[model samples]
Target: QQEYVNNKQLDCENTYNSTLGNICNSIPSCQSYLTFKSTPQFNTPSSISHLLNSSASLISQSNNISTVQTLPTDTIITVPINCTCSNNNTYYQHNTSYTIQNTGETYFTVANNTYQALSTCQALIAQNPYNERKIVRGNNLTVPLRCACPTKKQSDEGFKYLLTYLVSEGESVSSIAEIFNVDPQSINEANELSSTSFIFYFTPLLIPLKNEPPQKIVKH
Candidate 1:
């Protein structure tokens, strides 16, 4: 058993060295793998520090890191409007805004129309029961009350603004958030964005009852 354990340790170390060496070799100017240090079996902080310091010194000496140009700070532009459009034989009037941004020479726009459709779909899904279907007691059963509807609040108001921004500008979610003073999480939640193992696209996200906040109406 002791001999087997010793052999296993040796194998592990060999594996680690090979993997680290391969990674280091792939990067230009990276000479060699830094020695790994851990408790008991590989206990040596001095060796680890020396390896790290050497790697850092080598990188600094070579000046291999690229300098990234700073992006424009707060590039988002929001424009509010009141308009009426015919959809499915019903004319709906909406007061919303268009958010535009100039990010490093690229122009991005997001309009309210597409954003509204997407948000509505998300709200519908959230209000529906049995978002997921499962089999229970030899019968297919689905959980009722999966998610809640979008409420009246500043976040929702902000969501409308974001939707307007996305549709008018045709910008990506990442870029929109970067242009605005908002994070991807807030934009994603407001828009009901979803990602699956096989596919990735904005889907009707189920908003929880507790998560929904009071909505605020924005006048044009």
Candidate 2:
């Protein structure tokens, strides 16, 4: 019975209201996503699409990038996914698996650095039975990406999509609203924040968008 908190690890083991930090118990839906930054290994829509199990055209169209173009590092890109409620219907996510390609690869590294915290370390451990200590190169782990859809109340209020935003340093509610073209109040209400201050870096914040996020978007 802990109070719902934002900028926290999403409780993928419980069904809950949307306002309680982005985990939705409603029927699973698709077309919802989170923003990812381009890196050397995933600097193109085709590569990013392969990593997320989505289409290159979706990523390219969402970012207004040519599918064949190699984007510069740190270019903000939208990753489309099929939001699903799974693991006995207690959570929502998109399932993808990652292979351990580096000597130092761990759930923490893969989730936090590689996937940009889209997947939680807790989920990686729960979904895979491998002993963490024995994990080595070539082992594959299921990645449950954090994503969600609008609740019934939200849908009735006209929120069509929920964008999973990883809060970064120096970002505020209003600042994020300006970037996403959303109302500051709606952003506060969506994450159930009281003062719209005290956001933590690297925590996933749900931005309830009234429409799809604009293409070729970036965080200033």
Candidate 3:
């Protein structure tokens, strides 16, 4: 039998747990929720902190000791991954890993194209909650595999706006969202898009407008 320290497996696969799933290698960790059993063995932040309950930055500072056998009895893990994100939110475990660039491939574009809400994607890969609003490159991150219906929130007697848009081969959910200053997900759910990755050319789509546009009505 293998020796164990405090019941924590001494040699176990370092798992990455996020809504994205577990990465079995040392490719770093993604943000997620998790629980611990008798054993805790991993190097990634999620694995190390998810159950142990440590700040991400603090964990990073201890990366030199990434792989550990057992957490101190004082480990401060939080139950339920940080579920408080900007959007209420998966289609895949993951899709692609992209280098964030300034030339067009914006975070919105990445998330919308991946069929995920920008907010959800941000939450999935955020190193920490404090820097949620900014988008930039640090480490490689999954394209983010998360898709869900937009939350139904009522405006204060507002939103008398919508349209029948002719889908073009050149258009996408993100573009339509940009066209109206709305979240890409709004356009997605309003059109009832699921599995259908691209807009059908020349197809009429119900465009939900969040901004004031001509030939539109405002309702609460």
Name the candidate that leads on TM-score: 2
Query: What lDDT is obtained when candidate 2 is compared to the true structure?
Result: 0.73
Candidate 3 C-alpha lDDT tens digits along 74-177: 23221122211222111212233444545444444444332222223333344233233465655345543321211233122233333333344576777756
Give the clashing residue pairs of candidate 2, or none.
none
| lDDT (CA) per prediction | 0.23, 0.73, 0.35
Candidate of highest lDDT = 2
Task: Give the CA lDDT, 0 to 100, for residue 94 in model 1.
Answer: 31
Residue-wise C-alpha lDDT for candidate 1, range 24-133, written one tens digit per residue: 11111211111111223112323212222323333222222212222122222121222222223122223222221222210000111223112232222222232212
Tens-digit per-residue lDDT, 80-130, candidate 2: 778878777767778887888976777677777888877666667777887
Off by over 4 Å in 1: 1-78, 83-92, 95-150, 153-163, 167-171, 195-220
* Reference-based TM-score of each model: 0.23, 0.87, 0.26
Superposed on all Cα atoms, the candidates' RMSDs to the truth, in angstroms, are 27.6, 3.8, 21.4
- Give the 10-residue window scoring lowest on summed lDDT in candidate 3: 1-10
Question: Which portions of model 3 show Cα errors greater than 4 Å?
Answer: 1-158, 214-220
Q: Candidate 1 at 216: error in angstroms?
A: 25
Ranking by lDDT: 2, 3, 1
